[PDB]
Amino acid sequence: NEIPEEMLKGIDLTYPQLTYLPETGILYDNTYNEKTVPIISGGGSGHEPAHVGYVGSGMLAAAVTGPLFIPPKSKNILKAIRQVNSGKGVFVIIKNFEADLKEFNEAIKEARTEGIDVRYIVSHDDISVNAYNFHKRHRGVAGTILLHKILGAFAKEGGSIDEIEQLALSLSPEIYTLGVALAPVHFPHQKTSFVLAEDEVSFGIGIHGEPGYRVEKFEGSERIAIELVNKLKAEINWQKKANKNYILLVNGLGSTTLMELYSFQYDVMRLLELEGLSVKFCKVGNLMTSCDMSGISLTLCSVKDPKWLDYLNVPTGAFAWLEHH
Amino acid sequence: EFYNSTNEIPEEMLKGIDLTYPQLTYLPETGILYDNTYNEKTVPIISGGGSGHEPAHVGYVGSGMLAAAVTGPLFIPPKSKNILKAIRQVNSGKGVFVIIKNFEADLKEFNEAIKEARTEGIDVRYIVSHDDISVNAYNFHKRHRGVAGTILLHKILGAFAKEGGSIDEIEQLALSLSPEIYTLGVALAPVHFPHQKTSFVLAEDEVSFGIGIHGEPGYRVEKFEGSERIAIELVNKLKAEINWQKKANKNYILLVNGLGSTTLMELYSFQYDVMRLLELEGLSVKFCKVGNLMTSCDMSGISLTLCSVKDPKWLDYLNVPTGAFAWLEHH
């Protein structure tokens, strides 16, 4: 029930370009000089490096982090909006969770009544409910960070708040994610976020450690990749689209090792090649986690505009995405 | 729960790396991953060791850092033949520098390759990292393992080499930097393997101080009494070896390394607790790096590495940008 103050103070100590405002959950790019439109985001703690690792020049101007798996209070979101605001607009990326929407909506409304031009996009890339046939909301999950990177780059290169909103509206729909848990989140006192047999996996997972939508027997990593790819295919229908070019994220949910992640990416890259697709950009790592959960999510995004690859390849000062051309 | 094979080079993991990063090329069936941007214009540095420690050392291959890394099966160093292949490939007659961690198996393979390389006329030189202070902290007559502090050698020697350093100057820098590096780690949980086996047995209320990187039990089992007391223990032991109260130069480099399954929230919170203690101790940490820097499969654990900023130039070297995926930060 506490903002992870020590973690945020430790981030501030580690990175000269980042400053933490004590007791607010707000971490900001202290090099940001209000010359370009700021993009901000935030959410519960426990998904690191989402979103603290995405604060920096060319990505988020600030991120607002709440307690473990609980989004930040609207007053802190509002504080962050006012701080980065200079009368050019503020863009907010929100993950599609009822709790997050409540807090961000309240802050966005208040900010607007104060004269700040705030626009937003809600990330909703998770395909679990379609893949497994549920009537629930489409969660914003690892593919959210594509908005951070693409909108952040476009903003840094001078895009207006209007242009950024239009880009977000074009990008957001293209992003599709499905993940699976290999093991639940472990809490203190030998408790876990759900029960999962050792020979079982849980497909269709989000990020706050809730059980996924479909439990299946574990039949090896290859079979797991096949399932994820099969479900993504069913939503994307890439075989019917002339554009065969995709962006891919391979996301570890916390305690899946790097060797597992790169092995799994090899598998998935081969599967997509055998689907006749070209993956034009790949990022692999713990990109958006759920404490110490073991699992993996795959995100695919059509390269709808070749420029998007330019935006993905632009250097940033954000610690979890320093990669570039 | 699907770790690299114990009897084979992790070919899929390495090819997946190659597919991910345009600047990295994997040479199939050899374990050699190289910086494909490297032009032979500067002295190359290479390293290697078992798989299972990623991002060590595949994440440190890139412009400004390692020119190649040679990776073996899980927890088993690469065969001398593949190390020799890597040396020959990066060599252009200006020397080749090799960073080797102090483990008997690693020394055997690297020594064999270096010896054969030299008989072929290549000026290969090496440093062996031995930063683990576990045996002194806990009073054992065992080897001084090379552990997470090794990456300071990759970064500083790599930068110095990139800036034009000769093989002889690189060796001298290595001899200056290596003994400044002090590391101690603790496991909060052992490596978990298939079929419900662990790398060792650790009660839930216990931690294991003085760990290395291949999942063996630490030198000293203690009851867990909270993260702060863990930092106090590590810093107490490091202090006893470093004796910084006696040094005029209070400037340090710090690494806070997660051993695999320790979360980033835990790592940065721990970094903060440690930084506050080193502050109370009168130290100025002038560079810090936090993350999974050298792991042991899915072990939960942290190691702290301290290194005097003996030469202020070292901060410049630490801050130069590289092409290595696990160390892209710069000033």
Side-chain angles (χ1 to χ4, degrees):
Chain A
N1 223 188
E2 307 160 16
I3 293 178
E5 194 66 5
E6 285 187 342
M7 171 191 83
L8 291 161
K9 289 180 170 178
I11 291 167
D12 183 344
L13 285 172
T14 300
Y15 301 100
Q17 71 272 26
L18 294 181
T19 290
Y20 175 54
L21 293 165
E23 306 193 343
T24 65
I26 302 159
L27 181 69
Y28 66 94
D29 170 7
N30 65 44
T31 303
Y32 173 64
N33 249 111
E34 298 174 4
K35 304 292 141 111
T36 53
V37 173
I39 312 289
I40 65 173
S41 192
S45 198
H47 316 301
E48 295 81 12
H51 294 288
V52 289
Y54 306 114
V55 178
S57 182
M59 284 196 92
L60 305 174
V64 188
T65 291
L68 183 63
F69 291 167
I70 296 169
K73 299 221 209 162
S74 62
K75 77 170 143 127
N76 290 134
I77 300 171
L78 184 48
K79 185 178 241 286
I81 292 172
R82 288 168 172 169
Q83 181 178 310
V84 295
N85 176 56
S86 68
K88 318 179 175 38
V90 178
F91 201 85
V92 184
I93 298 168
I94 307 165
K95 291 185 309 289
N96 193 14
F97 290 92
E98 165 186 16
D100 293 45
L101 290 164
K102 169 167 209 292
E103 289 310 320
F104 275 95
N105 286 170
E106 173 179 351
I108 294 172
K109 292 170 198 176
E110 186 146 359
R112 296 179 168 176
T113 69
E114 291 177 11
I116 304 178
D117 182 4
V118 186
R119 320 275 176 104
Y120 68 88
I121 191 82
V122 178
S123 188
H124 59 276
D125 49 315
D126 185 15
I127 67 160
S128 289
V129 299
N130 299 111
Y132 300 116
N133 296 332
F134 286 79
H135 307 304
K136 297 282 171 277
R137 93 199 310 124
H138 300 245
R139 292 178 289 221
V141 294
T144 303
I145 71 171
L146 297 183
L147 297 160
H148 298 351
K149 179 80 176 71
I150 286 162
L151 298 187
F154 179 67
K156 177 81 182 150
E157 297 181 328
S160 61
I161 179 74
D162 280 359
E163 298 164 340
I164 287 160
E165 182 170 38
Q166 286 318 297
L167 178 52
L169 289 168
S170 177
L171 175 54
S172 189
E174 295 301 327
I175 305 165
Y176 294 84
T177 297
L178 182 62
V180 53
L182 281 12
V185 171
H186 298 74
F187 296 112
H189 310 294
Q190 328 128 258
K191 153 153 82 73
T192 58
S193 60
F194 56 89
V195 29
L196 188 65
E198 216 224 5
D199 62 353
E200 284 181 349
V201 289
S202 181
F203 279 96
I205 35 86
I207 57 180
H208 303 94
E210 289 291 343
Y213 278 113
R214 212 229 269 240
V215 175
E216 310 214 80
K217 285 298 172 85
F218 178 74
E219 231 71 60
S221 52
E222 301 87 345
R223 189 85 84 90
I224 292 184
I226 289 165
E227 165 90 354
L228 295 184
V229 174
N230 282 349
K231 296 304 187 163
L232 285 163
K233 193 172 162 161
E235 299 310 313
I236 298 169
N237 295 290
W238 47 65
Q239 78 275 12
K240 316 210 265 208
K241 329 299 184 88
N243 185 351
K244 304 298 177 180
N245 297 329
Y246 286 87
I247 297 145
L248 171 65
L249 305 180
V250 178
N251 176 54
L253 291 165
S255 66
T256 304
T257 67
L258 221 38
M259 62 185 134
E260 282 168 309
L261 292 185
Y262 284 104
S263 296
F264 201 73
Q265 198 231 177
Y266 173 80
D267 184 331
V268 172
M269 291 281 145
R270 298 300 198 215
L271 285 184
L272 299 177
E273 292 163 3
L274 287 163
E275 286 305 283
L277 311 181
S278 313
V279 170
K280 290 300 186 191
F281 184 89
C282 191
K283 185 166 169 77
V284 178
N286 279 11
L287 311 187
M288 180 172 293
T289 59
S290 181
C291 296
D292 66 342
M293 174 171 272
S294 320
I296 296 187
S297 69
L298 295 183
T299 296
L300 283 167
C301 179
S302 170
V303 180
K304 189 184 172 191
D305 183 343
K307 273 300 311 215
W308 296 359
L309 287 180
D310 295 345
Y311 306 138
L312 286 164
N313 285 303
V314 158
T316 83
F319 73 74
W321 201 321
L322 299 164
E323 351 170 347
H324 48 84
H325 198 242
Chain B
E1 168 127 36
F2 57 96
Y3 297 151
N4 327 42
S5 177
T6 251
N7 50 312
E8 323 179 46
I9 289 158
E11 184 91 349
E12 290 181 333
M13 175 194 87
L14 294 161
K15 187 49 174 185
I17 292 172
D18 167 310
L19 290 173
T20 298
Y21 302 102
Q23 70 267 31
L24 297 178
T25 297
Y26 173 53
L27 287 172
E29 304 297 349
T30 72
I32 301 166
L33 183 78
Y34 67 96
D35 170 18
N36 64 41
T37 237
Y38 173 69
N39 45 8
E40 297 183 356
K41 290 197 181 145
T42 56
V43 175
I45 318 294
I46 67 164
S47 192
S51 173
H53 316 297
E54 296 77 13
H57 295 289
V58 290
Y60 304 117
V61 180
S63 173
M65 219 154 173
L66 304 179
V70 190
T71 297
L74 181 71
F75 291 167
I76 291 167
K79 289 167 179 317
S80 73
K81 71 181 185 189
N82 294 129
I83 297 168
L84 179 57
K85 185 173 274 291
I87 289 163
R88 281 184 114 235
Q89 181 186 292
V90 295
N91 173 56
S92 68
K94 59 198 51 101
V96 173
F97 201 79
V98 181
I99 298 161
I100 308 160
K101 294 184 309 293
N102 186 24
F103 292 92
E104 186 176 357
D106 296 46
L107 300 176
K108 172 184 181 306
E109 301 301 329
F110 275 93
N111 290 161
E112 186 162 13
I114 292 172
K115 300 214 165 219
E116 349 180 75
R118 298 190 60 91
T119 83
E120 307 182 344
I122 310 176
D123 196 355
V124 188
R125 307 218 197 157
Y126 67 88
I127 194 64
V128 174
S129 58
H130 56 272
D131 50 317
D132 188 17
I133 66 159
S134 295
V135 314
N136 294 133
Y138 302 114
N139 294 329
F140 287 79
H141 303 325
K142 300 298 168 313
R143 102 170 19 229
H144 294 228
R145 296 177 284 215
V147 299
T150 308
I151 75 171
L152 293 175
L153 292 161
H154 294 167
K155 184 78 184 66
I156 287 162
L157 301 187
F160 181 70
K162 187 66 179 148
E163 290 178 20
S166 73
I167 182 74
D168 206 81
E169 288 156 347
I170 287 161
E171 187 175 39
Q172 291 297 306
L173 178 53
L175 285 163
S176 176
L177 165 66
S178 176
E180 290 302 325
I181 305 164
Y182 294 75
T183 304
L184 183 59
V186 56
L188 284 354
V191 170
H192 299 79
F193 300 108
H195 317 275
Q196 283 234 235
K197 49 221 192 186
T198 44
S199 66
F200 59 94
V201 166
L202 225 211
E204 77 193 347
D205 63 350
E206 295 183 329
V207 298
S208 185
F209 280 98
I211 40 95
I213 65 182
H214 305 90
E216 297 284 338
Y219 281 107
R220 173 78 81 131
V221 178
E222 300 179 35
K223 211 114 276 186
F224 172 76
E225 288 305 0
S227 56
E228 183 73 9
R229 288 300 179 146
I230 294 185
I232 289 157
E233 163 91 341
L234 293 178
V235 172
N236 166 267
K237 292 302 177 168
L238 280 162
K239 181 165 163 93
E241 298 312 308
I242 295 171
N243 306 113
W244 50 62
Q245 70 277 8
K246 292 175 200 260
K247 295 168 101 338
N249 179 359
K250 300 305 207 238
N251 301 141
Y252 287 85
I253 293 146
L254 174 74
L255 310 178
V256 179
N257 177 51
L259 278 153
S261 71
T262 299
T263 64
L264 235 42
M265 181 183 288
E266 294 174 292
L267 293 177
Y268 283 108
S269 302
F270 198 69
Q271 189 253 199
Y272 178 75
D273 295 326
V274 170
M275 289 283 268
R276 279 272 212 173
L277 292 171
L278 301 174
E279 284 177 34
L280 300 182
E281 288 285 325
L283 308 192
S284 300
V285 166
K286 288 319 237 226
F287 182 92
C288 183
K289 181 169 178 58
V290 179
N292 281 8
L293 317 180
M294 183 182 292
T295 55
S296 179
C297 289
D298 65 340
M299 167 173 288
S300 184
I302 301 185
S303 73
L304 293 181
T305 292
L306 283 170
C307 175
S308 171
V309 190
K310 180 189 174 179
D311 181 344
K313 293 187 173 227
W314 293 0
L315 294 177
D316 290 329
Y317 301 144
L318 286 168
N319 278 309
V320 302
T322 81
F325 77 70
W327 200 325
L328 301 169
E329 325 71 279
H330 54 88
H331 112 315

